[PDB]
């Protein structure tokens, strides 16, 4: 009475790695995603696998534009 | 193999510089592409094997 099922895949730890208002260094990953759940705005770039990474030191921000959630890096002012 | 690993070597310095899979059915001949040869420090036409 064998079972045809039983297989699965590994833990691709997707999800947002830096949330709103979080201070980031350049190059850091912001979301690991499959597809285009999020888009890039200002100072945000897309990697090979639809990853989103910072392009300047700053603070993360999540907004929307034209109907698609986008991630931006607002430049923190030096106090 | 249908898609064996073929090695491409520059024509000038004859250094085996690259390797990649090519099809023997779609292209049953030795392809010729221009790649970068580090020895010559310049682009040189590269040919299979």
């Amino acid at each position: 009475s064998s079972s045809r099922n039983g297989r699965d895949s590994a833990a691709q730890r997707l999800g947002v790695k830096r949330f709103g208002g979080q201070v980031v260094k350049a190059g850091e990953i912001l979301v690991r995603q499959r597809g285009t759940h999020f888009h890039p705005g200002v100072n945000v770039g897309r990697g090979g696998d639809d990853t989103l990474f910072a392009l300047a030191p700053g603070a993360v921000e999540f907004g929307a534009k034209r109907g698609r959630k986008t991630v931006n890096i607002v430049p923190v002012a030096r106090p | 193999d249908v898609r064996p690993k073929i090695t491409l070597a520059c024509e000038v310095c004859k250094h085996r510089n690259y390797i990649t899979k090519k099809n023997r059915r779609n292209d049953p001949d030795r392809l010729e592409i221009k790649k970068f040869c580090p020895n010559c420090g310049t682009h040189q036409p590269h040919k299979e094997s």
Binding site: - | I19, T20, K21
Partner: protein, 63 residues
């Protein structure tokens, strides 16, 4: 008696000028085609051993 030193580790790990233990990365010997040059460059070099196995490697090297 004398404490023998493990060969398989004395010939796989090194000791820097301060004490770090370094090692060469794996997955770079054969089947190097289809491994993008980025991956190969990543696998080249000598990285410090993880602190987890640092003690094990130290025991193996010192005897």
């Amino acid at each position: 008696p004398k404490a023998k030193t493990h060969s398989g580790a004395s010939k796989r790990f090194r000791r820097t000028g301060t004490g770090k233990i370094v090692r060469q990365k794996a997955n770079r010997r054969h089947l190097l085609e289809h491994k993008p040059t980025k991956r190969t460059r990543r696998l080249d070099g000598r990285t410090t051993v993880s602190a987890a196995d640092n003690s094990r490697i130290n025991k193996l090297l010192n005897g």
